[model samples]
Target: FPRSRLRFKEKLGEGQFGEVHLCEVLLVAVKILRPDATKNARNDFLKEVKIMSRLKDPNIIRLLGVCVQDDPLCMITDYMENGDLNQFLSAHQLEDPTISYPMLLHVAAQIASGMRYLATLNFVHRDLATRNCLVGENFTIKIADFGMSRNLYAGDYYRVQGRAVLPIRWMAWECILMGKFTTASDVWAFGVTLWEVLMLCRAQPFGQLTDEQVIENAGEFFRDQGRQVYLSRPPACPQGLYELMLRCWSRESEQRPPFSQLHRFLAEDALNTV
Candidate 1:
């Protein structure tokens, strides 16, 4: 909580209204809000602090502290040396600490485990992606980026800003059409994230397709109704694992496998594959 104790080291990355930096004193990542950021952005930053403070899990990024004295507010969290999982996977696919199939399964399993925790708490991570996951030492992965996370009340779903641009490629049909967010939809995104992980983050959900094309393709798939749309699976993915991805992307939210089931599957795969 003492801002004076924090010594700036290097800028990590920039967000919409803030910058994250590495701090020398505590070995933490400090997310400092820009002085000129809007009131809404500051409020959102605080909301993130509040939400993150309640979550306690090894697979979720740990929030350390915050500084709200004045402008340039700061929220400190655990510093992930390897950075986001996507960037790490992209740069280190075949390098030192190479990602073998079992390692990939381990990472995927951890993500599902984290999502299972969130699901247990009735939290919906509207933005579940490889880019939102961080890699720590020894291939430890933690779910980060709570910017789009929301608590579901009353029913199982929350209708967010429908007009906001969506990550269409990772979205479920209900999310795309109705702007509805639920644990099930998060599962849908997790399925796409599995694709990204299996492809070693070298490929995206729709790979080379434009945004418009992705949307059109999603619509076409739904229009067909009876048929299930399958993306070209990664060459390294086992047939069973690819099947689980399809299960997560099911049209009816009720049909999509929950994170618990996915976690169990991955856990078993991780143990057996090794």
Candidate 2:
């Protein structure tokens, strides 16, 4: 965790807070804190470190350690050889990795397991998405709520507030409308995420809707007038799995199944606890 021990290789990408780099000594990802960050921002970064460090599930990205004494603070985390899920799926549609229906279920079930563990800690991954999940070797995926890890491929596209950029498309009706976030909302995101996986990240959620249109569509869910813009079933998605997405999108928060149920079902469905 010593800053002295860390040798910076090439820049991995730009992070919201600062630059992310490939560290030479054991090849960890170092998420550097901005050099000119204010006092509060450092505290917030450490806060993130503390909480993320608590997560120990294999499917959750591991927070290896930190280099706090240095001028540029950096947090080390396990690096995925591939990349984030959104980019990974897109690349796959073209790793040497095979993309198939069964393979997707295996990948998705791992997410459910990671989320289930987070649920045990009462953690709300407000930014859950394909982008927040990293794809590793052998269809392995680890859930990562690393805010800095976002949009490294492009404009870092997000909402008005760079820090508070909400995932309106993946959000539940209550979360979008009432400003409420809970495990239920995370479950809602999981549904969207699963959709992202199944669709091979080929299409954005509510791909037809504008940002405003996406919120109005949330209104449709609140009214329950039967016009909620649910994601269409992927051609590769099974009827049973598509139905599961419907369950997660249930209008009432209480109606959506908990992470426990989701992990249970997905693991069973995948037939490998994979």
Give the number of the best model, judged by TM-score. Answer: 2
Candidate 2 lDDT over 1-274, as tens digits, reads 6788888887877755666788888688888877777777788788888887788989999899888786677889887888788888887752135586667887888999999999999989887888888877777899985667345433223367545666788888898787799999999999999998988888888887787888898899878888877899987777888899999999888999998888877778555422
Give a tens-digit lDDT track for model 1, residues 153-264. 1112223476564667788877776778999999999999999899898776775776666666667657866543567788778888889999998877899998989999
Off by over 4 Å in 1: 94-97, 148-162, 226-228
Residue 62 lDDT (model 1): 87
Clashes of each: 0, 0
Clashing pairs in 2: none
Write down the lDDT of every candidate, Cα atoms only: 0.81, 0.82
In candidate 2, which residue ranges exceed 4 Å CA deviation? Answer: 94-97, 149-158, 161-163, 270-274
lDDT of prediction 2: 0.82
Tell me the deviation in Å of residue 266 in model 2: 1.9
